[PDB]
């Protein structure tokens, strides 16, 4: 019964999603705003949001409980990631700002690590990006890990899998992964232990590091406190000889 606003206070300004769009809340602060068909299951379908605060994580403001439904958020200036690497700042980016972007993350997920939390389908498509290439964790065989497509065992260490997949992302500035492989390929040839190769001119070291995330042993596979600290450090202690190429 906390959080509730009256309906009064939210102008909803241009759409985005299909419904999301971008707002005013209280005529003063800009917003994202997640309606609800009333619905669709709805009020079912927010209390997961409300149990979790911290920088790197999209931010629940408000909601609205009685139909028909609302919920408000943290609106980001520069949409999801996918559409980043893409289209026109695609050409732009290099090594040093992917590696960074890529840490930020690693922080959003070293959070619900710690938290106890799963996410359960991290990649690019579901990281927000806002002003100053800052990047969040927001709300598809080819992006989960083998455990959790086949069997359901979802975990943090299932997410990191997934992480290194948005690394490949990254580095190919939003390519979808397995190039001309179709889902059922990508599944049998994983299962032999396929994984794959270095992309072009990304340094060895960081196909390393997706190849760690890789694992057929989820144990094995390291820590968003590990891939956050990595990434953090890359420049000086990995590739400190580095050299800006063409794409990277
Ligand atoms: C049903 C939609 C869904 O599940 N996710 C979703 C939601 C929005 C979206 O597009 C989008 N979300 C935004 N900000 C958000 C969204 C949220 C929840 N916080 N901040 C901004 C945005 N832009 C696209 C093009 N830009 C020039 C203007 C801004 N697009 C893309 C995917």
Known sequence: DAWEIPRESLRLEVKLGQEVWMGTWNGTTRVAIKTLKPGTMSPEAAQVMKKLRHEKLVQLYAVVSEE?????????SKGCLLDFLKGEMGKYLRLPQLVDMAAQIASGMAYVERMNYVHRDL???????????????????KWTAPEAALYGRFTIKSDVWSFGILLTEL???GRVPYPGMVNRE?????????????????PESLHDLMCQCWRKDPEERPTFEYLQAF????????????????NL
């Open 171 to 173: 580095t190919t500035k």
């Open 186 to 202: 990508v599944l049998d040839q994983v299962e032999r232990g396929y994984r794959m190769p270095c992309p072009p001119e990304c």
């Open 231 to 246: 990434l953090e450090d890359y420049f000086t202690s990995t590739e400190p000889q580095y050299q800006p190429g063409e």
């Open 123 to 141: 990649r690019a498509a579901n990281i927000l990006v806002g002003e100053n290439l800052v990047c969040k964790v927001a709300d598809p065989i």
């Open 68 to 76: 028909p439904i609302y919920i408000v958020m943290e609106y980001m």
